[PDB]
Amino acid sequence: VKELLEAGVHFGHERKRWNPKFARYIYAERNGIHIIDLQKTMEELERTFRFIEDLAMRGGTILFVGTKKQAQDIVRMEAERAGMPYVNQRWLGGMLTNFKTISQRVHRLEELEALFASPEIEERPKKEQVRLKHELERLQKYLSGFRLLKRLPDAIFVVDPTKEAIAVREARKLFIPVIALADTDSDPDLVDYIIPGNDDAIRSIQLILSRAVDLIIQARGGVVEPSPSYA
Amino acid sequence: LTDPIADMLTRIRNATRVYKESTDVPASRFKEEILRILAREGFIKGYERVDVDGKPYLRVYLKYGPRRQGPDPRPEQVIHHIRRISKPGRRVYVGVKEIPRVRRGLGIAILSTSKGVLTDREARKLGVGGELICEVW
Amino acid sequence: DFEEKMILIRRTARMQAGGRRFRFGALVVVGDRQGRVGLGFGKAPEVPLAVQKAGYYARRNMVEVPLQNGTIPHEIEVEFGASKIVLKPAAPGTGVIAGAVPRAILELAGVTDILTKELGSRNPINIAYATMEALRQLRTKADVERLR
Amino acid sequence: GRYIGPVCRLCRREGVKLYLKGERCYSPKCAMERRPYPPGQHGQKRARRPSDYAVRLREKQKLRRIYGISERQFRNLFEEASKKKGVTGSVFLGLLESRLDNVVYRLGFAVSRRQARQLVRHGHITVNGRRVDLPSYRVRPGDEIAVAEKSRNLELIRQNLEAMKGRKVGPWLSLDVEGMKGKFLRLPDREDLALPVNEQLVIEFYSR
RNA sequence: AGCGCCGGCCAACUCCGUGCCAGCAGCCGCGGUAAUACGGAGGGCGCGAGCGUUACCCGGAUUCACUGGGCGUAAAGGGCGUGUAGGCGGCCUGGGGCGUCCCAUGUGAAAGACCACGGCUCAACCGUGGGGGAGCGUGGGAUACGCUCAGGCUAGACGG
RNA sequence: CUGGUCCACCCGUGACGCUGAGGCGCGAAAGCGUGGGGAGCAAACCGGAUUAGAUACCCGGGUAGUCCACGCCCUAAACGAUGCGCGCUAGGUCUCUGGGUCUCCUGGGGGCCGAAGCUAACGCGUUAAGCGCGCCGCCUGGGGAGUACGGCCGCAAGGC
Ligand code: SF4
Ligand SMILES: [Mg+2]
Ligand SMILES: [Mg+2]
Ligand SMILES: [Mg+2]
Ligand SMILES: [Mg+2]
Ligand SMILES: [Mg+2]
Ligand SMILES: [Mg+2]
Ligand SMILES: [Mg+2]
Ligand SMILES: [Mg+2]
Ligand SMILES: [Mg+2]
Ligand SMILES: [Mg+2]
Ligand SMILES: [Mg+2]
Ligand SMILES: [Mg+2]
Ligand SMILES: [Mg+2]
Ligand SMILES: [Mg+2]
Ligand SMILES: [Mg+2]
Ligand SMILES: [Mg+2]
Ligand SMILES: [Mg+2]
Ligand SMILES: [Mg+2]
Ligand SMILES: [Mg+2]
Ligand SMILES: [Mg+2]
Ligand SMILES: [Mg+2]
Ligand SMILES: [Mg+2]
Ligand SMILES: [Mg+2]
Ligand SMILES: [Mg+2]
Ligand SMILES: [Mg+2]
Ligand SMILES: [Mg+2]
Ligand SMILES: [Mg+2]
Ligand SMILES: [Mg+2]
Ligand SMILES: [Mg+2]
Ligand SMILES: [Mg+2]
Ligand SMILES: [Mg+2]
Ligand SMILES: [Mg+2]
Ligand SMILES: [Mg+2]
Ligand SMILES: [Mg+2]
Ligand SMILES: [Mg+2]
Ligand SMILES: [Mg+2]
Ligand SMILES: [Mg+2]
Ligand SMILES: [Mg+2]
Ligand SMILES: [Mg+2]
Ligand SMILES: [Mg+2]
Ligand SMILES: [Mg+2]
Ligand SMILES: [Mg+2]
Ligand SMILES: [Mg+2]
Ligand SMILES: [Mg+2]
Ligand SMILES: [Mg+2]
Ligand SMILES: [Mg+2]
Ligand SMILES: [Mg+2]
Ligand SMILES: [Mg+2]
Ligand SMILES: [Mg+2]
Ligand SMILES: [Mg+2]
Ligand SMILES: [Mg+2]
Ligand SMILES: [Mg+2]
Ligand SMILES: [Mg+2]
Ligand SMILES: [Mg+2]
Ligand SMILES: [Mg+2]
Ligand SMILES: [Mg+2]
Ligand SMILES: [Mg+2]
Ligand SMILES: [Mg+2]
Ligand SMILES: [Mg+2]
Ligand SMILES: [Mg+2]
Ligand SMILES: [Mg+2]
Ligand SMILES: [Mg+2]
Ligand SMILES: [Mg+2]
Ligand SMILES: [Mg+2]
Ligand SMILES: [Mg+2]
Ligand SMILES: [Mg+2]
Ligand SMILES: [Mg+2]
Ligand SMILES: [Mg+2]
Ligand SMILES: [Mg+2]
Ligand SMILES: [Mg+2]
Ligand SMILES: [Mg+2]
Ligand SMILES: [Mg+2]
Ligand SMILES: [Mg+2]
Ligand SMILES: [Mg+2]
Ligand SMILES: [Mg+2]
Ligand SMILES: [Mg+2]
Ligand SMILES: [Mg+2]
Ligand SMILES: [Mg+2]
Ligand SMILES: [Mg+2]
Ligand SMILES: [Mg+2]
Ligand SMILES: [Mg+2]
Ligand SMILES: [Mg+2]
Ligand SMILES: [Mg+2]
Ligand SMILES: [Mg+2]
Ligand SMILES: [Mg+2]
């Protein structure tokens, strides 16, 4: 499902603002910008997906983590397309480690889904209506991709391990594997199944997530044609 | 430099804490004999006579444990512990009958003897004592 | 389920206007006397709540210790900041010769024959943690041969 | 010498029946079977958690109060077992058992060790022929423990032998009834007796 | 049959009396009218022809740290250089064999100790036997490391 | 007139090295001796205020001294409260000064943030308080006390 034209979509970026552990994956520093070996990238792409592919044909959950602007919407695209939980906005502290209490809040979301599904007592105070309707807007913003999650994932997928070090930590504490796209600023050893590539160009975010989500449904029954993506 | 031997052991110990694939020590026909024992007893993947800027060195290829689970994915060491026993400040000599069992058997005491560099096991085998070089486990 | 033993129960206080306000802490070790032990330190506004909580952490933090006829495989020494614990292999007839804190751990660990000694600071909390990290570092003839 | 006092207060403190009387022990007029709580003004008050030390004091006092023996001789044996090869617990228990007054009570010659002592003490017992009046004699394998014939024709021995027809006596002991004479076969394995004592804790008492 | 103890360490709890008094006390600390902490009593704990105290030794004290500690702010880097003695010292190859290691051998009295058995009715005590070691004298052996002498090298050091 | 030091070249010497009990020198300020000098400043001292008092803080004065020469003293928060040398253990950034090809690379210094690791914590972190070897100095509860006695140094103050 892979390719050889990933250099036609990213080949990596970012200057001498690196993590010295990532050295084994970098080829050269070009325009004062570290350039990732793409040959090295594929090697892991093989290894990484091999793990993903085993999880897909076993039918186990995946958690998609990405909150930078570059990977803001492009997760909601690919995650729903895989039908698996994601996080688009603020990654709440303790979603995994304190799952029981975090998930205790989704039952309020499902509770608001209940009441505002019409009608049950619209004779409730005008201020009361306003609050809850406002409260629904709030919960939806953060918990939209997290309600799909009803148990602790068999793995989590991350856009920026540096940016989402909090998540990685929780998974580390819970023996939950970490698959991730990661450029030169990230800690390679902290990631289990690593995708050493650009995490800012919306190109590479697409290729890596899509071809992952393509691999997701492919071993789950059927194949499909390319997904929606703004150039 | 005042203790060539210790420097080596320290070069190794330091290099293993950051999991270097290899590391270089200034060469010596005695450092080699020690390194030989270190490789055979399975502490290191091995060594080879290299050159650095025309100068003789010994490159030592380091051996570690498997990738680990949890918050610290750092593998275990193969050399958890290595340190000088005898020193320039104080030469430590033991007869055969007083050769210590390193870690109840799980480790070795490298020793320099009048019949070559031997381990504690081998010393009792060959039946000789000598200067206690170091202990490793 | 496992067997539980309280090691330490202490009161601590903090300050606010109008007086000092308290909290209780509970060192709790837990084990099956078959080579599996756990240590937890539980803190809560009351005594029994804290002990309960300790037991919860105690199971949340385990370590599989390799007994061999009721004794550890090799000698082990670990320092935890200021506190130091010494563990030494002992014959069948020996019994456990240990301070109360590492004794509580090694009895629930099923260790029946071991020589020990505390050194440095004997802070129970720190001594406790120190002993676990020592057990956590015990290796077998296999484990040693396996690595190499 | 030995404890020589009120003996039911012992059991009530130990929380266990120590069969120190013989007959009365089995009757429902036993101290434990009527009051299973400690002797004295505060025996019914709810006990507080016994200290680590408290636990080991009791178990040693228990094992010692069983044999009606002085703390010195107790200590000295333990020490002798502490020096001697093997599992210290076994050797200690065996050595405590190899005492003449105990062997006499074990082979059923008496109802209580307390009574078993006076039998030894008053010359009523013999070993391999010769008379022995020493409650401390170290019984070895091969020792023929007999009643002196000049003491054979006595009520108290008869009544107590009249109970020893079919009562089985440990794997390390033999017995010839009627003839009033038995033999010490071997040193009791820990298995051979199921004394209410975790003897590991006794070692730990003395390691302070 | 006695003696000590029963606040925590540390095993053993209640009543009366006193009221910062009388007194206890190894340390923390007790007593100013609700004292398991003083004195008495009952009861309890521990030992037992002994129990307690004082004195001293070692231990706990890894608190003179060889085993086995420390010196930024806890006690602790000399105000700084220069250098005597001393201590320590790079890579290679030889000779010696002092240190070092091995074997043989002599000495290492007896008693004590350790292990086994045996004599006193047991034990204490005592007898017979057994295992030894350090350490030094001696002869033989080894040479990796330390040493020494000899000959080389240039990574330290110094000079152009 | 003169010391230290860094770089480049990689030409010379062949371990000639490191540390250093004593010893020797140097050692801010104040202080002492002899002789100069003396504008400003300013211990002591005088006065004016403040104040309960004000032998102070503030103000008006003001002598030693501060300055020079030569000779003494040898103390300190003489501090990085961190002895010297050496090897090894991610980097990021600011700066000074050299050499290359000058994008930048490579040395030697001066800071900051930080991998690993250390640490009781604070914090240290290639300028280690990391991991190691060598040598010296020093610590061993608070006060008594840097006191006493003795000794050595000093003109004294006083120092060790
Ligand atoms: S009767 Fe025998 S058993 Fe029951 S208490 Fe008195 S002594 Fe113990
Ligand atoms: Mg990035
Ligand atoms: Mg040593
Ligand atoms: Mg294990
Ligand atoms: Mg500690
Ligand atoms: Mg420490
Ligand atoms: Mg063993
Ligand atoms: Mg201490
Ligand atoms: Mg203490
Ligand atoms: Mg007596
Ligand atoms: Mg009985
Ligand atoms: Mg024994
Ligand atoms: Mg039976
Ligand atoms: Mg003892
Ligand atoms: Mg007493
Ligand atoms: Mg009280
Ligand atoms: Mg008590
Ligand atoms: Mg009343
Ligand atoms: Mg009065
Ligand atoms: Mg008294
Ligand atoms: Mg009162
Ligand atoms: Mg009263
Ligand atoms: Mg009283
Ligand atoms: Mg008292
Ligand atoms: Mg006496
Ligand atoms: Mg003492
Ligand atoms: Mg000592
Ligand atoms: Mg030392
Ligand atoms: Mg200390
Ligand atoms: Mg130092
Ligand atoms: Mg200094
Ligand atoms: Mg001086
Ligand atoms: Mg010299
Ligand atoms: Mg020399
Ligand atoms: Mg040399
Ligand atoms: Mg030579
Ligand atoms: Mg020689
Ligand atoms: Mg002798
Ligand atoms: Mg005999
Ligand atoms: Mg003899
Ligand atoms: Mg001996
Ligand atoms: Mg000899
Ligand atoms: Mg030679
Ligand atoms: Mg030469
Ligand atoms: Mg050079
Ligand atoms: Mg030069
Ligand atoms: Mg040259
Ligand atoms: Mg030449
Ligand atoms: Mg010097
Ligand atoms: Mg000097
Ligand atoms: Mg001066
Ligand atoms: Mg001056
Ligand atoms: Mg003057
Ligand atoms: Mg003058
Ligand atoms: Mg004058
Ligand atoms: Mg003048
Ligand atoms: Mg003037
Ligand atoms: Mg005035
Ligand atoms: Mg006035
Ligand atoms: Mg006045
Ligand atoms: Mg003025
Ligand atoms: Mg003026
Ligand atoms: Mg004057
Ligand atoms: Mg003058
Ligand atoms: Mg003057
Ligand atoms: Mg200064
Ligand atoms: Mg300064
Ligand atoms: Mg400086
Ligand atoms: Mg100082
Ligand atoms: Mg200080
Ligand atoms: Mg110095
Ligand atoms: Mg330049
Ligand atoms: Mg620099
Ligand atoms: Mg810093
Ligand atoms: Mg860290
Ligand atoms: Mg340290
Ligand atoms: Mg803190
Ligand atoms: Mg740096
Ligand atoms: Mg510097
Ligand atoms: Mg420190
Ligand atoms: Mg004093
Ligand atoms: Mg003092
Ligand atoms: Mg003085
Ligand atoms: Mg002074
Ligand atoms: Mg004087
Ligand atoms: Mg001084």
JSON list of N, CA, C and O in Angstrom, two decimals, chain B residues 37 85 99-102 107-112 118-121 123 132-136:
[
{"chain": "B", "resi": 37, "resn": "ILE", "atom": "N", "xyz": [38.60, -11.84, 27.67]},
{"chain": "B", "resi": 37, "resn": "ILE", "atom": "CA", "xyz": [37.78, -12.45, 28.72]},
{"chain": "B", "resi": 37, "resn": "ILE", "atom": "C", "xyz": [36.40, -11.82, 28.78]},
{"chain": "B", "resi": 37, "resn": "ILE", "atom": "O", "xyz": [35.40, -12.50, 29.00]},
{"chain": "B", "resi": 85, "resn": "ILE", "atom": "N", "xyz": [39.39, -3.19, 41.23]},
{"chain": "B", "resi": 85, "resn": "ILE", "atom": "CA", "xyz": [39.61, -3.70, 42.57]},
{"chain": "B", "resi": 85, "resn": "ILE", "atom": "C", "xyz": [41.01, -3.31, 43.01]},
{"chain": "B", "resi": 85, "resn": "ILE", "atom": "O", "xyz": [41.18, -2.44, 43.86]},
{"chain": "B", "resi": 99, "resn": "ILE", "atom": "N", "xyz": [40.02, -16.18, 46.66]},
{"chain": "B", "resi": 99, "resn": "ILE", "atom": "CA", "xyz": [39.38, -15.55, 45.50]},
{"chain": "B", "resi": 99, "resn": "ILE", "atom": "C", "xyz": [37.86, -15.50, 45.64]},
{"chain": "B", "resi": 99, "resn": "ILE", "atom": "O", "xyz": [37.21, -16.54, 45.78]},
{"chain": "B", "resi": 100, "resn": "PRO", "atom": "N", "xyz": [37.28, -14.29, 45.63]},
{"chain": "B", "resi": 100, "resn": "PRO", "atom": "CA", "xyz": [35.86, -14.06, 45.92]},
{"chain": "B", "resi": 100, "resn": "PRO", "atom": "C", "xyz": [34.92, -14.48, 44.80]},
{"chain": "B", "resi": 100, "resn": "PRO", "atom": "O", "xyz": [35.24, -14.35, 43.61]},
{"chain": "B", "resi": 101, "resn": "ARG", "atom": "N", "xyz": [33.75, -14.99, 45.18]},
{"chain": "B", "resi": 101, "resn": "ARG", "atom": "CA", "xyz": [32.72, -15.38, 44.23]},
{"chain": "B", "resi": 101, "resn": "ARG", "atom": "C", "xyz": [31.82, -14.20, 43.91]},
{"chain": "B", "resi": 101, "resn": "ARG", "atom": "O", "xyz": [30.99, -13.79, 44.72]},
{"chain": "B", "resi": 102, "resn": "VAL", "atom": "N", "xyz": [32.02, -13.63, 42.73]},
{"chain": "B", "resi": 102, "resn": "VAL", "atom": "CA", "xyz": [31.29, -12.44, 42.34]},
{"chain": "B", "resi": 102, "resn": "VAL", "atom": "C", "xyz": [29.80, -12.70, 42.17]},
{"chain": "B", "resi": 102, "resn": "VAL", "atom": "O", "xyz": [29.40, -13.49, 41.32]},
{"chain": "B", "resi": 107, "resn": "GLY", "atom": "N", "xyz": [28.52, -13.45, 38.35]},
{"chain": "B", "resi": 107, "resn": "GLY", "atom": "CA", "xyz": [29.49, -12.52, 37.80]},
{"chain": "B", "resi": 107, "resn": "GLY", "atom": "C", "xyz": [30.90, -13.06, 37.92]},
{"chain": "B", "resi": 107, "resn": "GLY", "atom": "O", "xyz": [31.13, -14.11, 38.52]},
{"chain": "B", "resi": 108, "resn": "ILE", "atom": "N", "xyz": [31.86, -12.34, 37.34]},
{"chain": "B", "resi": 108, "resn": "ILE", "atom": "CA", "xyz": [33.24, -12.81, 37.34]},
{"chain": "B", "resi": 108, "resn": "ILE", "atom": "C", "xyz": [34.24, -11.80, 37.90]},
{"chain": "B", "resi": 108, "resn": "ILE", "atom": "O", "xyz": [34.02, -10.58, 37.83]},
{"chain": "B", "resi": 109, "resn": "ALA", "atom": "N", "xyz": [35.32, -12.31, 38.47]},
{"chain": "B", "resi": 109, "resn": "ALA", "atom": "CA", "xyz": [36.45, -11.47, 38.83]},
{"chain": "B", "resi": 109, "resn": "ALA", "atom": "C", "xyz": [37.57, -11.74, 37.84]},
{"chain": "B", "resi": 109, "resn": "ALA", "atom": "O", "xyz": [38.15, -12.83, 37.83]},
{"chain": "B", "resi": 110, "resn": "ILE", "atom": "N", "xyz": [37.88, -10.76, 37.01]},
{"chain": "B", "resi": 110, "resn": "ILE", "atom": "CA", "xyz": [38.99, -10.89, 36.10]},
{"chain": "B", "resi": 110, "resn": "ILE", "atom": "C", "xyz": [40.23, -10.74, 36.94]},
{"chain": "B", "resi": 110, "resn": "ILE", "atom": "O", "xyz": [40.30, -9.86, 37.80]},
{"chain": "B", "resi": 111, "resn": "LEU", "atom": "N", "xyz": [41.22, -11.61, 36.72]},
{"chain": "B", "resi": 111, "resn": "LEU", "atom": "CA", "xyz": [42.46, -11.54, 37.48]},
{"chain": "B", "resi": 111, "resn": "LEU", "atom": "C", "xyz": [43.69, -11.70, 36.59]},
{"chain": "B", "resi": 111, "resn": "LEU", "atom": "O", "xyz": [43.67, -12.44, 35.61]},
{"chain": "B", "resi": 112, "resn": "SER", "atom": "N", "xyz": [44.75, -11.00, 36.95]},
{"chain": "B", "resi": 112, "resn": "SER", "atom": "CA", "xyz": [46.01, -11.16, 36.26]},
{"chain": "B", "resi": 112, "resn": "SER", "atom": "C", "xyz": [46.87, -12.10, 37.08]},
{"chain": "B", "resi": 112, "resn": "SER", "atom": "O", "xyz": [47.13, -11.84, 38.26]},
{"chain": "B", "resi": 118, "resn": "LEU", "atom": "N", "xyz": [42.90, -14.74, 33.88]},
{"chain": "B", "resi": 118, "resn": "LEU", "atom": "CA", "xyz": [41.93, -15.80, 34.14]},
{"chain": "B", "resi": 118, "resn": "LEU", "atom": "C", "xyz": [40.73, -15.24, 34.89]},
{"chain": "B", "resi": 118, "resn": "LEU", "atom": "O", "xyz": [40.80, -14.15, 35.46]},
{"chain": "B", "resi": 119, "resn": "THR", "atom": "N", "xyz": [39.62, -15.97, 34.89]},
{"chain": "B", "resi": 119, "resn": "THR", "atom": "CA", "xyz": [38.51, -15.61, 35.77]},
{"chain": "B", "resi": 119, "resn": "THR", "atom": "C", "xyz": [38.65, -16.36, 37.08]},
{"chain": "B", "resi": 119, "resn": "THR", "atom": "O", "xyz": [39.53, -17.22, 37.22]},
{"chain": "B", "resi": 120, "resn": "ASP", "atom": "N", "xyz": [37.79, -16.03, 38.03]},
{"chain": "B", "resi": 120, "resn": "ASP", "atom": "CA", "xyz": [37.78, -16.69, 39.33]},
{"chain": "B", "resi": 120, "resn": "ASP", "atom": "C", "xyz": [37.63, -18.20, 39.16]},
{"chain": "B", "resi": 120, "resn": "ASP", "atom": "O", "xyz": [38.35, -18.98, 39.78]},
{"chain": "B", "resi": 121, "resn": "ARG", "atom": "N", "xyz": [36.68, -18.59, 38.32]},
{"chain": "B", "resi": 121, "resn": "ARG", "atom": "CA", "xyz": [36.46, -20.00, 38.00]},
{"chain": "B", "resi": 121, "resn": "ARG", "atom": "C", "xyz": [37.73, -20.66, 37.50]},
{"chain": "B", "resi": 121, "resn": "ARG", "atom": "O", "xyz": [38.13, -21.72, 37.99]},
{"chain": "B", "resi": 123, "resn": "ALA", "atom": "N", "xyz": [40.79, -19.64, 37.72]},
{"chain": "B", "resi": 123, "resn": "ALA", "atom": "CA", "xyz": [41.90, -19.56, 38.65]},
{"chain": "B", "resi": 123, "resn": "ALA", "atom": "C", "xyz": [41.92, -20.80, 39.54]},
{"chain": "B", "resi": 123, "resn": "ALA", "atom": "O", "xyz": [42.97, -21.42, 39.74]},
{"chain": "B", "resi": 132, "resn": "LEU", "atom": "N", "xyz": [44.02, -8.95, 41.75]},
{"chain": "B", "resi": 132, "resn": "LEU", "atom": "CA", "xyz": [42.61, -8.89, 41.41]},
{"chain": "B", "resi": 132, "resn": "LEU", "atom": "C", "xyz": [42.32, -7.67, 40.54]},
{"chain": "B", "resi": 132, "resn": "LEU", "atom": "O", "xyz": [42.28, -6.55, 41.03]},
{"chain": "B", "resi": 133, "resn": "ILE", "atom": "N", "xyz": [42.13, -7.88, 39.24]},
{"chain": "B", "resi": 133, "resn": "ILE", "atom": "CA", "xyz": [41.93, -6.75, 38.33]},
{"chain": "B", "resi": 133, "resn": "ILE", "atom": "C", "xyz": [40.64, -5.99, 38.58]},
{"chain": "B", "resi": 133, "resn": "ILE", "atom": "O", "xyz": [40.66, -4.82, 38.98]},
{"chain": "B", "resi": 134, "resn": "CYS", "atom": "N", "xyz": [39.51, -6.65, 38.35]},
{"chain": "B", "resi": 134, "resn": "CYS", "atom": "CA", "xyz": [38.22, -6.02, 38.59]},
{"chain": "B", "resi": 134, "resn": "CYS", "atom": "C", "xyz": [37.12, -7.07, 38.73]},
{"chain": "B", "resi": 134, "resn": "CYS", "atom": "O", "xyz": [37.34, -8.25, 38.50]},
{"chain": "B", "resi": 135, "resn": "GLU", "atom": "N", "xyz": [35.94, -6.61, 39.13]},
{"chain": "B", "resi": 135, "resn": "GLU", "atom": "CA", "xyz": [34.77, -7.47, 39.20]},
{"chain": "B", "resi": 135, "resn": "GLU", "atom": "C", "xyz": [33.67, -6.92, 38.29]},
{"chain": "B", "resi": 135, "resn": "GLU", "atom": "O", "xyz": [33.44, -5.71, 38.22]},
{"chain": "B", "resi": 136, "resn": "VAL", "atom": "N", "xyz": [33.00, -7.82, 37.58]},
{"chain": "B", "resi": 136, "resn": "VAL", "atom": "CA", "xyz": [32.01, -7.43, 36.57]},
{"chain": "B", "resi": 136, "resn": "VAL", "atom": "C", "xyz": [30.75, -8.31, 36.61]},
{"chain": "B", "resi": 136, "resn": "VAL", "atom": "O", "xyz": [30.83, -9.53, 36.72]}
]
